[PDB]
Design a protein around this ligand. Structure first.
Ligand code: ZN
Lengths: 155, 24, 118, 60, 127, 98, 206, 80
RNA sequence: CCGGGCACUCUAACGGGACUGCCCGCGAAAGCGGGAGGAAGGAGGGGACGACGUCUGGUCAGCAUGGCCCUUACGGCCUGGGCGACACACGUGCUACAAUGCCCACUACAAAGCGAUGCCACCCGGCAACGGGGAGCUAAUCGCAAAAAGGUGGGCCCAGUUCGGAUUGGGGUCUGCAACCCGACCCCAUGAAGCCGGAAUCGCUAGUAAUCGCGGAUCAGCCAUGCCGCGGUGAAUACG
C-alpha cells in the first residue's frame, strides 16, 4: 500500500439473514474456493444451533463474534538494538476479520467429527466466555494491558 | 488419489482405460 | 472367524476384512462372495456358520496364500539369485529392480539416508 | 546440420523407426517442428518476415 | 404479451423470454429450481426481477447454455433484469442503483510464459 | 443449391476474393445461401526465443484459417454461367461441392 | 538481449509476406522449402541488381512469383536474354508453371536491405567505416526518406577488440506500431572475421 | 511382469548358429553380439558369448535360465 | 430428426463506444475526493512491444566466420553398450499425509484446440491392456471425448484406516527387427513412508491465490508429474 488506502473488497450481505458477515464468514469456512459446501456448512451450522438450542443463531454469530473481536494487540519495532512489543488497539474491519476468522481456526482445532458441527458447535461456546476463539482473543488481548509497560511508544 | 491406479481417479489424473475404468 | 492358515478377520465389513489375508485384496474380496454368494454387506462378527465355512472352504481351496505363499516368492526371488540374471543384482544389492535411477530417490528399496560427505 | 549426419535424407534406414527428422535449414536434430520441416530457431527470425505466411505475432 | 432482455456474464449465454403470469420459470430443459439444485446462489439470479417486487406478475423461459453453472445463474441475472425495461423501461427507481444490469467483464487471465498461470510465478532459491 | 468452400490464411480477402462471387449469377434463377462466416481455426506455437537456454519467453505466433462459403440458391443452370470460371483469388482458396 | 525484428512486429500490418499465398497440412511443409528456392535461385544472382524482395502469389499448380530488382536492366538482357537461361532452369527442379515478374524499384536509397549490402559492399570495398555510414543516412535521408540507421559491428576496420558502431538519423519510431519503417540486414564475409550491419529505414507514416 | 505378445522374439540369425550346433552334437562356445534374443531350451550346455560393451563373457545357459533374455546376463556397469 | 424461419446466442468481417465531454467542490493550471447518465471510464482487464548502455553474461555444440589442430586418421559406416550407474548432498515437481475426505452408482453444464495412415460413433470376445468387424468425417454440422470440481443416494466412522500407493512376486496386451541393461499400459497379489513437516524459505493484490479437469507440442511408442494454452468454481488482505 505505497499509494491507495485500498478500496476494501466491499462485499454484500447474504440470501439468509441479509447481513454481510455471513458470506464473509462462510468465505473463511470456505476452502479451495468451493463456496458451495462452504455456504452449506454455515447454514447447517445453524442446523444444530437451532436443534440443540432455540435462540435464532442470528445474534449468536453476533453476540458471539463481538466477544472474539479484540480491541488490543502487539507489533514490535526495533528502535534501539531490540524488538519491543508495543501495546495498542485495533481497527474495525481487522478487529473484525481477526474475530470472524479466529472462529474457523479454533473451529476446526476441535473434536467434533463432523464439519458443520465443529462450526455450529463453536458458535455455541462462542457467546459464552469459553470459546476456542475467545481464548486466542483473550490470550492475544491480555498480552496487552500487560505490556502496558510500553504503550508510551503508543503510536 | 491420483497416481493410485486401479480406481477412477487413477485413470483420471493418469487418464486411462482398464477394468476399474470402462465405457459406461 | 478364522479363515486362511494363521488368519482371522473380525468385526469389520467382510468384503473388507478378508483383505487381511495374505493372498487377498479388495479384488478377490468380491470374487469370494461370488461363488460363495455370501451376503456381501455384512460383519464377520455376524456371519452364519454355513457361511464362514463356504469362505474358508473356498478361499483355502482355490488359491495359494499365507506362509505357503510368502515362501513361494522368497524361494521365487531366491531364484533370480543362483543364476546370473540382472534382477538378482538388484536383490543381491537391495536396490531398485524394475528400471529406476539410484543417483537420487531410491530410498524406499535402499533404506535410511546413510550420509557421508560428497 | 552436419552432412555426415544429414544422410537421413535416405528415408532408407534399415528399420523404419530410424528417420531422425532433422531441420531443413538449421539441420540440428531436435526441436525440428514437423509442420515447417525446419527448426524452432529459424522459424522465429524466419517467419519474422514472410518465409512463413499465415503467421502473425500471436498476441491476445 | 411478450418482451426480452438478453443478459450474459462471466462466459455464459442466456435467452430470457418473459411474459405475464405468476412464477412458473424454467431453463435449458428442466425448470429453474430443477437444473440448479437449490444452490444458495440461483435464488439471487432471479432477485433482479424482484426490483419493485412482482414475481407473481411476470414469468419466463430461459435457455442459458454455455460455460458453467456459476456463470449460468449469473447470465440469467441480467436478462430477468434487462427484461423489465422492455416492458417497464422506466423500472429503474431502484434498478440501476442495483446494477443487476451491469455486464461484469470479470474474465480469465491467459497463461503467460515463464510463470505457471498468467501470474502464478514459480519457486526460485538462494539469492 | 450449390456450395463453395472459401477457406484461407487472410481474413477479409478470403472475404473479398469471394465477395464478388455473389450477384454475378443471382440474376436469372434465384437467390443465394448467403456469404457465410464460419468459426476460424487457429494454430498457435511457441519456442525458446533464444538459441540456448532461457525459459520464460519463447515468443508467440498464430495462423488463422478463416472460412466462408456463399452458395447460390436455385442457380438454374444459366443462373451459374453468370460467374463461371471467372475470378481473381490468388493466395486464397475456394472449392465447390453441393 | 532486447528488441526484435521491425517488420516482424509488423507483418500482419505495414509489410506483406514474401511467399504471400495459402496451402494446408498435406501441403505448405515444402511449399516453403521450394518457396525458399525461389530465393536460393531467383536471388543467388540478381543481387548485382535487385534481390529486393521476391514475394510469390501462387494459386494452385500455377505460380505468379515476382522477383524485384533496383536494376531492372540486369534481370533481362537482349529483350529477354537472362529472363530465360535459368528463368526456366527455375523450373529445372520445380516447373509447376512458376514464372517471373520484375518491377521498378524506385530508389535503392530507400531500401536499406540494399543500403546494407551497400555498406556491406563498401564494408568490403574497405570504404571509410563510419563515413559511408553517415553518408548512408544522408543518401537515404536525401531520397525523400525520413529515418535511417546503420549498425555495423565486430572488430570494425579489421580492428582487434570487437566493437559495434552506431549512426542513424531523424526518426526511428521502432516501437511505433504503424510507421512504414523498413529494415534489411547485410552480412559481409571478412578477411579478419565477419561483420554485418542492420540499416533501418523509417518512411511515410500512416 | 513380462512381455513379448503373441509370437516370441529371438534374433533369427543366431538360431541357425545354434539349432545346427546341437543338430550334430554340440560345441564349446558361440560368438554373436546379440542379447536381444530369447534364451531357448536346447541352448543347454551350448555356452554362448553375449557382449558387454568391450569384453565378452560365457553363458553356460540352462532351462531355468530360459524365460529370460540373452541380455539379462550382460553386467554393464561396475559397482563397488 | 421434417418443413419452415433470423427476431435469439452464436460465428468472423466492419464500424460504432470513453474525451474528465456533464454538475458540485478546491483550483493559477494540469487535475484529485466526489455524483449523473453509460454495458464499461479516467489508461475498464490482459497482452505483443523491452531505451543510450551494463555485466565483457551464453553457446564457436544449430548455423556462420577471423586461428591453435587433424588426416590412415579425434574425418566416415555399423553392432552392441553408454547418456537411465549409486555412500551420498541440492533444485524443481508429482502424490499424499484424509471426513470441507475417500469409493461406487445415476445424471449434467467448458473453452481452446487436434485427426489419411489419422482421430475412431457402434456391435462383438474380453475383469483388462487390447485384437477382430465395422457408419460417417475430407472435418461450426463426423469425431477425438467423455471433461473434472459439483449434485441426489447410498457404502466408510477416526482406524496407518476402503486414507495413501512407494516396493515387490506372477500373468498379459501394445509399439516396435528389436524394449536384459532400458519402454509405457491392464489385471491379481503385495501393500511400504507419510498422522501436515527444524532453522530457513517461494508465489500471489481478483477472477488473482487455492483447486478440477480438457487440449496440443515433439513422437513408433515413450520413461511428460515437465512445457505452452482453456475454461469450471472463485477468496483472503494491504494500518502504513
Ligand atoms: Zn533452423
Amino acid at each position: 500500500a505505497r499509494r491507495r488506502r485500498a478500496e476494501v473488497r466491499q462485499l454484500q450481505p447474504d440470501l439468509v439473514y441479509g447481513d454481510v458477515l455471513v458470506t464473509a464468514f462462510i468465505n473463511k469456512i470456505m476452502r479451495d474456493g468451493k463456496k458451495n459446501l462452504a455456504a452449506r456448512i454455515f447454514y447447517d451450522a445453524c442446523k444444530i444451533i437451532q436443534e440443540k438450542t432455540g435462540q435464532e443463531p442470528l445474534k449468536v454469530f453476533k453476540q458471539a463474534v463481538e466477544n472474539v473481536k479484540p480491541r488490543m494487540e502487539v507489533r514490535s519495532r526495533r528502535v534501539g538494538g531490540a524488538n519491543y512489543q508495543v501495546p495498542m488497539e485495533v481497527s474495525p474491519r481487522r478487529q473484525q476479520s481477526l474475530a470472524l476468522r479466529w472462529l474457523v481456526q479454533a473451529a476446526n482445532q476441535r473434536p467434533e467429527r463432523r464439519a458443520a458441527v465443529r462450526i455450529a458447535h463453536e458458535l455455541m461456546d462462542a457467546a459464552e466466555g469459553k470459546g476456542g476463539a475467545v481464548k486466542k482473543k483473550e490470550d492475544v488481548e491480555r498480552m496487552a494491558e500487560a505490556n502496558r509497560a510500553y504503550a508510551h511508544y503508543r503510536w | 488419489g491420483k497416481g493410485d491406479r486401479r480406481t477412477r481417479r487413477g485413470k483420471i489424473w493418469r487418464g486411462t482405460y482398464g477394468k476399474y475404468r470402462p465405457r459406461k | 472367524a478364522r479363515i486362511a492358515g494363521v488368519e482371522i478377520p473380525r468385526n469389520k465389513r467382510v468384503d473388507v476384512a478378508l483383505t487381511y489375508i495374505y493372498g487377498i485384496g479388495k479384488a478377490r474380496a468380491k470374487e469370494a462372495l461370488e461363488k460363495t454368494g455370501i451376503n456381501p454387506a455384512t460383519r464377520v462378527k455376524d456371519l452364519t456358520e454355513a457361511e464362514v465355512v463356504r469362505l474358508r472352504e473356498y478361499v483355502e481351496n482355490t488359491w495359494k496364500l499365507e506362509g505357503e505363499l510368502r515362501a513361494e516368492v522368497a524361494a521365487n526371488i531366491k531364484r533370480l539369485m543362483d543364476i546370473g540374471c540382472y534382477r538378482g543384482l538388484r536383490h543381491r544389492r537391495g536396490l531398485p529392480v524394475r528400471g529406476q535411477r539410484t543417483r537420487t530417490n531410491a530410498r524406499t528399496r535402499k533404506g535410511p539416508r546413510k550420509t557421508v560427505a560428497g | 546440420a552436419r552432412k555426415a549426419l544429414i544422410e537421413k535424407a535416405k528415408r532408407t534406414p534399415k528399420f523404419k523407426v530410424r528417420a531422425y527428422t532433422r531441420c531443413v535449414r538449421c539441420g540440428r536434430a531436435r526441436s525440428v517442428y514437423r509442420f515447417f520441416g525446419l527448426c524452432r530457431i529459424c522459424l522465429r527470425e524466419l517467419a519474422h518476415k514472410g518465409q512463413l505466411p499465415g503467421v502473425r505475432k500471436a498476441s491476445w | 404479451e411478450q418482451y426480452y432482455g438478453t443478459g450474459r456474464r462471466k462466459e455464459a449465454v442466456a435467452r430470457v423470454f418473459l411474459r405475464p403470469g405468476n412464477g412458473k420459470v424454467t431453463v435449458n430443459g428442466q425448470d429453474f429450481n430443477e437444473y440448479f439444485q437449490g444452490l444458495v446462489r440461483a435464488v439471487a439470479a432471479l432477485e433482479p426481477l424482484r426490483a419493485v417486487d412482482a414475481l407473481g406478475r411476470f414469468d419466463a423461459y430461459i435457455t442459458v447454455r454455455g460455460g458453467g453453472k456459476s456463470g449460468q445463474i449469473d447470465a440469467i441475472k441480467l436478462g430477468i433484469a434487462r427484461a423489465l425495461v422492455q416492458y417497464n423501461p422506466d423500472y429503474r427507481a431502484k434498478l440501476k442503483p442495483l446494477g443487476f444490469l451491469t455486464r461484469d467483464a470479470r474474465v480469465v487471465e491467459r497463461k503467460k510464459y515463464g510463470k505457471h498461470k498468467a501470474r502464478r510465478a514459480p519457486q526460485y532459491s538462494k539469492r | 443449391k450449390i456450395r463453395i468452400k472459401l477457406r484461407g490464411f487472410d481474413h477479409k480477402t478470403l472475404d473479398a476474393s469471394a465477395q464478388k462471387i455473389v450477384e454475378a449469377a443471382r440474376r436469372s434463377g434465384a437467390q443465394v445461401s448467403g456469404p457465410i462466416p464460419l468459426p476460424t481455426r487457429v494454430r498457435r506455437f511457441t519456442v525458446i526465443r533464444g538459441p540456448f537456454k532461457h525459459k520464460d519467453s519463447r515468443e508467440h505466433f498464430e495462423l488463422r484459417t478463416h472460412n466462408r462459403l456463399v452458395d447460390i440458391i436455385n442457380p438454374n443452370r444459366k443462373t451459374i454461367e453468370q460467374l463461371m470460371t471467372l475470378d481473381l483469388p490468388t493466395g486464397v482458396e475456394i472449392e465447390i461441392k453441393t | 538481449g532486447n528488441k526484435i525484428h521491425p517488420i516482424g512486429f509488423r507483418l500482419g500490418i505495414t509489410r506483406d509476406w514474401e511467399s504471400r499465398w495459402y496451402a494446408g497440412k498435406k501441403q505448405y511443409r515444402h511449399l516453403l522449402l521450394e518457396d525458399q528456392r525461389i530465393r536460393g535461385l531467383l536471388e543467388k544472382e540478381l543481387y548485382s541488381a535487385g534481390l529486393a524482395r521476391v514475394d510469390i502469389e501462387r494459386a494452385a499448380d500455377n505460380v505468379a512469383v515476382t522477383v524485384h530488382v533496383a536494376k531492372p536492366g540486369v534481370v533481362i538482357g537482349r529483350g529477354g536474354e537472362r529472363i530465360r537461361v535459368l528463368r526456366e532452369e527455375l523450373a529445372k527442379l520445380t516447373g509447376k508453371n512458376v514464372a517471373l515478374n520484375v518491377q521498378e524499384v524506385q530508389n535503392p536509397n530507400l531500401s536499406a536491405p540494399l543500403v546494407a549490402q551497400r555498406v556491406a559492399e563498401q564494408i568490403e570495398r574497405r570504404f571509410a567505416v563510419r563515413r559511408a555510414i553517415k553518408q548512408a543516412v544522408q543518401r537515404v535521408m536525401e531520397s525523400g526518406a525520413k529515418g535511417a540507421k546503420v549498425i555495423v559491428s565486430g572488430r570494425i576496420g579489421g580492428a582487434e577488440q570487437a566493437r559495434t558502431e552506431w549512426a542513424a538519423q531523424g526518426r526511428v519510431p521502432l516501437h511505433t506500431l504503424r510507421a512504414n519503417i523498413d529494415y534489411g540486414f547485410a552480412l559481409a564475409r571478412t578477411t579478419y572475421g565477419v561483420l554485418g550491419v542492420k540499416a533501418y529505414i523509417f518512411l511515410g507514416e500512416v | 511382469p513380462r512381455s513379448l505378445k503373441k509370437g516370441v522374439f529371438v534374433d533369427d540369425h543366431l538360431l541357425e548358429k545354434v539349432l545346427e550346433l546341437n543338430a550334430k552334437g554340440e560345441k564349446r562356445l558361440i560368438k554373436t553380439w546379440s542379447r536381444r534374443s530369447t534364451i531357448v531350451p536346447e541352448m543347454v550346455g551350448h555356452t554362448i558369448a553375449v557382449y558387454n560393451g568391450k569384453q565378452h563373457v560365457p553363458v553356460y545357459i540352462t532351462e531355468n535360465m530360459v524365460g529370460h533374455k540373452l541380455g539379462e546376463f550382460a553386467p554393464t556397469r561396475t559397482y563397488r
